């Protein structure tokens, strides 16, 4: 069996049953990653994501050398690359980890049709998510749960997620090690940022190193018993922890089930004789919840044609969008967030809310689809389901939430880090301002602006909205929207919010 | 407590004290046995009601097109802001979603629109999409 294994996500060798399947059969095994290098000059992805990806691939490549095989990086489209590769390798069996996402699913349907009528058998596993998303929906009467609390009610009545699959051994690697073509496997070699057309100059090391090896180490540190034992938000947390797992999850450099059980195990050994609360797994469960909600909704990342999304009249405004995208709003908190975003590829979820809210219902009133697109380009952990998900949640567009909670571009920031040292890390044209005025530079006397060598209106821009008058405007608009949706005639705002299936 | 009689036959009797909503009829002895083109599957109906999309009805209306057709034609005869309103509320549910062509099939309506008449109509109608 000349079996090809196909990485898309699931960029790892641990808990990769699709790969166990490519292998169980003997004959030849090649691991490939199709990559579209001229779709890669396209802006749909910044350096940080691309760089994260190549490093995952390089690590994979390295991991495969340790198994006397190598990583095959073919270039172009899956369709009309798999054909040519089929003949050329006399391929027998193609395997990959299942993709629940609408586009992915469709893509994969075509690929498997085009494999049947060509003699190649296909085997898929689902190891990107904790459960079979399809089962969860079956059990919920063939509809996805549309609130997290309902999502939890259900999971709590369900069986535990499968345990992580063991990795393939060398043992069965030679049993199908391929003949790598010497100085030509580097016509299948992992490209470089320069190659994909990226200015590489004064880069510096990635804040989030890519690949399974890094992911596995971060896991162990993350779970180091007493460091872990913590559960009041910090501020230190705004900075990219070296134990954060989110990008590895999104790329599949880290198996989500592994993470699940190692979590379980440690909790067992700490709180002892006990079964833990679902909140322990909060990070993994929200992910599942967005995945589950997204599999059968191909318009999931849009407003129109999206059955779960409330139609809200956002204004198209590339001017305001740009100011937000570029960290040129007057608000240090907001601009500090967006700067760290663009720079490193990760920002704490509390900062995601601040920034998401500022853009949607809090201030700019720009559509959430636009926030999605910017995050898709900059945020390492933002895939289709999870990113559309949070944006619909945050803009109060879906999932039946309450819209009265405000994220102040000044207050919320000062309260999550009064010291101002976050702002002083990313907005350094403000080193000099005292904490007293740094969340609100324009409210400092010129005597203080000058001692800080920063003149609001010059060195740093002035706020682009009066938050108060905006707050008042946007609250009203939500009010109306939820009112005509509940048909609630009445004067309270907690009552305009439906809590499940429309009315 | 009084009594009546239909065009086809000579059968029925009914109160007027409990039947507090005998309207477009409260006009004969307001000056038996005086009723024309109607029938009987019209009595309990107005009777279950008239002491207060409720169903029942979905149960009570689950009849054949031909019957629903006359239920409405009878519905008017004797005003019924509930039982004509409701036979209508129904026909509506049948319509909502259809194309002009689908509404014609599921109602037996032959199309008597020349072609100018009809094209002129579909033109104005697309104005009702935003």
């Amino acid at each position: 069996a000349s079996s090809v294994h196909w990485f898309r996500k699931g960029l790892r060798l641990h808990d990769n049953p699709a790969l166990l399947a490519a292998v169980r059969g003997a004959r030849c095994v090649r691991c490939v990653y199709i990559l579209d290098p001229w779709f890669a000059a396209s802006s749909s992805v910044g350096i940080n994501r691309w760089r994260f990806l190549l490093q995952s691939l390089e690590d994979l490549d390295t991991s495969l050398r340790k198994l006397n095989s190598r990583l095959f990086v073919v270039r172009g489209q899956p369709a009309d690359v798999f054909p040519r590769l089929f003949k050329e390798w006399g391929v027998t069996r193609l395997t990959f980890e299942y993709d629940s996402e609408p586009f992915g699913k469709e893509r994969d349907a075509a690929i498997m049709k085009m494999a049947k009528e060509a003699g190649v058998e296909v085997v898929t596993e689902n190891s990107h998510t904790l459960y079979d998303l399809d089962r969860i929906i079956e059990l919920n009467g063939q509809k996805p749960p549309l609130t997290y609390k309902r999502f939890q009610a259900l999971i709590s009545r369900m069986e535990l997620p499968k345990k992580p699959a063991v990795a393939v051994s060398s043992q069965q690697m030679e049993s199908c090690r391929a003949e790598i073509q010497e100085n030509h496997d580097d016509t299948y070699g992992v490209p470089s940022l320069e190659e994909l057309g990226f200015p590489t100059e004064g880069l510096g090391p990635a804040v989030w190193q890519g690949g399974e090896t890094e992911a596995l180490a971060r896991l162990d540190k993350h779970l180091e018993r007493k460091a872990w034992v913590a559960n009041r938000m910090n501020a230190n947390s705004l900075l990219a922890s070296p134990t954060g797992l989110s990008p590895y999850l999104r790329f599949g450099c880290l198996s989500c089930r592994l993470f699940y059980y190692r979590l379980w195990d440690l909790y067992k050994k700490v709180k002892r004789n006990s079964t833990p609360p679902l909140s322990l797994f909060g990070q993994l469960l929200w992910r599942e919840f967005f995945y589950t909600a997204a599999t059968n909704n191909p318009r999931f990342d849009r407003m129109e044609g999206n059955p779960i999304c409330i139609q809200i009249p956002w204004d198209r405004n590339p001017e305001a969008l740009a100011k937000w995208a570029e960290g040129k709003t007057g608000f240090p908190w907001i601009d500090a967030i967006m700067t760290q975003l663009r720079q490193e590829g990760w920002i704490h979820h509390l900062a995601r809310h601040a920034v998401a809210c500022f853009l949607t219902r809090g201030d700019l009133w720009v559509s959430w689809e636009s926030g999605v697109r910017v995050f898709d380009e900059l945020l390492l952990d933002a895939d289709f389901s999870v990113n559309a998900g949070s944006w619909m949640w945050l803009s109060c567009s879906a999932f039946f939430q309450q819209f009265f909670h405000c994220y102040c571009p000044v207050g919320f920031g000062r309260r999550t880090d009064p010291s101002g040292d976050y702002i002083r890390r990313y907005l350094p044209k403000l080193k000099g301002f005292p904490s007293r005025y740094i969340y609100e530079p324009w409210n400092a006397p010129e005597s203080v602006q000058k001692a800080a060598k920063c003149i609001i209106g010059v060195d740093y821009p002035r706020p682009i909205v009066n938050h108060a008058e905006t707050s008042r405007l946007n609250i009203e608009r939500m009010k109306q929207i939820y009112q005509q949706l509940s048909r609630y005639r009445g004067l309270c705002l907690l009552a305009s919010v439906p809590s499940c299936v429309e009315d | 407590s009084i009594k009546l009689q239909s065009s086809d036959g000579e059968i029925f009797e009914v109160d007027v004290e409990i039947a507090k909503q005998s309207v477009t009829i409260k006009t004969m002895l307001e000056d038996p046995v005086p009723l024309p083109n109607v029938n009987a599957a019209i009595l309990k109906k107005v009777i279950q009601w008239c002491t207060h999309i409720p169903v029942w009805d979905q149960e009570f209306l689950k009849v054949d097109q031909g019957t629903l057709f006359e239920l409405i034609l009878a519905a008017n005869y004797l005003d019924i802001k509930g039982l004509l309103d409701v036979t209508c509320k129904t026909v509506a549910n049948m319509i909502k979603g259809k194309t002009p062509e689908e509404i014609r099939k599921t109602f037996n309506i032959k199309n008597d629109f020349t072609e100018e008449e009809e094209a002129q109509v579909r033109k104005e109608n697309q104005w009702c999409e935003e």
């Binding site: 967005f290 945050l394 009265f404 | 008017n76 909502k96 002009p100 629109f113 109608n125 999409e129």
Partner: protein, 394 residues
């Protein structure tokens, strides 16, 4: 047949279909088509004025707009304009208003979807268009006119025209109306059942003009309090004498107050018994002010706070449960309450709270309750399954 059923029948049916369904319906046959343009199906219309430049939505078809005006100008009674961010949109609305000479409107709404594009018009162009309605509609009941450049003079045209009719007036964020301005409205329009406006235009004279004898009983008064300019503005003060006169005349009145204030710009605010009934703090609130809310608002029904700060509010929530025996609905984010105090809170009102929305981070555990324990206790006193709200961690 069904084709020629009746026609006043088809109308009954049509009353039950949305516009596009009527349109298709009206295509079925000659006899049904004649039902479409009947006045009863045209008492009501909402104009969508928006542009691909500036809107993700769809506009009302331009041809439909002409047809409405040509064929139903005298059937229309309830009309609103939703207008998006572009000037051309606000200008289109005016172009439509200015043609409503044969209209007799009971209700008119001018809604700004996004940026307040009516403010982008030259004043007189807007006024002139609105005037066509003030003058020609003799039975005007409601008027929603937020984010609009209307002025004192035009209000006098309004009053002089429909003072025998006006019941709703919503007009907050209307910069060219001065306190002296509204007074004429309150004064002459004896039927004014409800009114929404900025605090700046709220005066003792106004309250008294509304507590007066000639006047009907108010059902609804909504006030917005906005920090519209610098980092700490100093609001004026109403005499308690005015507030007390006000509940006296209208004892079931609802008094909705939304505050968007900063650090204690609140000084003039909760200093004596107000008849306040609904409250929203859309910016931030002080523990001290919240205490004064407790001491001051025996009529609170709903209370929503979006943020407060640092000090656990244990005693403020307890006092409010204590003194607001009418409290049915309560929402809190971005502040702190001990679990124990929160439980003590729900024990008191409890069965009375139809709505209770708390973001998770608000609760602090103690020697007695852990985060995992409270949803069970709170649910028991509420009488329904209940949880603190969560936010996604992505």
């Amino acid at each position: 047949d069904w084709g020629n059923l009746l026609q006043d029948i088809i109308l009954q049916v049509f009353k039950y279909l949305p516009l596009l369904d009527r349109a298709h319906a009206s295509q079925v046959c000659r006899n049904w088509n004649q039902v479409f343009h009947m006045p009863d199906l045209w008492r009501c219309f909402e104009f969508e004025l928006n542009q691909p430049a500036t809107s993700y939505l769809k506009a009302t078809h331009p041809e439909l707009i002409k047809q409405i005006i040509k064929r139903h100008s005298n059937h229309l009674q309830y009309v609103s304009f939703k207008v998006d961010s572009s000037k051309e949109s606000a200008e289109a609305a005016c172009d439509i208003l200015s043609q409503l000479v044969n209209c007799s409107l009971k209700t008119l709404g001018l809604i700004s979807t996004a940026r307040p594009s009516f403010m982008d018009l030259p004043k007189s162009h807007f006024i002139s268009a609105l005037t066509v309605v003030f003058v020609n509609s003799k039975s005007l009941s409601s008027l929603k006119i937020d984010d609009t450049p209307v002025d004192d003079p035009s209000l006098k045209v309004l009053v002089a025209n429909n003072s025998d009719t006006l019941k709703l007036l919503k007009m907050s964020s209307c910069p060219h109306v001065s306190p002296a301005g509204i007074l004429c409205v309150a004064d002459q329009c004896h039927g004014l059942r409800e009114l929404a406006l900025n605090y700046h235009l709220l005066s003792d004279e106004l309250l008294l003009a509304l507590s007066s004898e000639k006047h009907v009983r108010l059902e609804h008064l909504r006030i917005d309090v906005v920090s519209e300019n610098p980092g700490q503005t100093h609001f004026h003060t109403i005499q308690k004498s005015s507030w007390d006169a006000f509940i006296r005349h209208s004892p079931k009145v609802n008094l909705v107050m939304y505050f968007f204030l900063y650090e204690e710009e609140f000084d003039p605010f909760f200093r004596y018994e107000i008849p306040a009934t609904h409250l929203y703090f859309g910016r931030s609130v002080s523990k001290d002010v919240l205490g004064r809310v407790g001491m001051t608002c025996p009529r609170l029904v709903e209370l929503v706070v979006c943020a407060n700060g640092l000090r656990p509010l244990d005693e403020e929530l307890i006092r409010i449960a204590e003194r607001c025996k009418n409290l049915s609905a309560i929402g809190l984010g971005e502040c702190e309450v001990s679990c124990s105090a929160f439980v003590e809170f729900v024990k008191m009102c409890g069965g009375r709270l139809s709505q209770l929305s708390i973001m998770e981070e608000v609760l602090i555990p103690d020697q007695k309750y852990s985060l995992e324990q409270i949803h069970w206790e709170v649910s028991k006193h509420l009488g329904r399954v209940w949880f603190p709200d969560m936010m996604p961690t992505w």
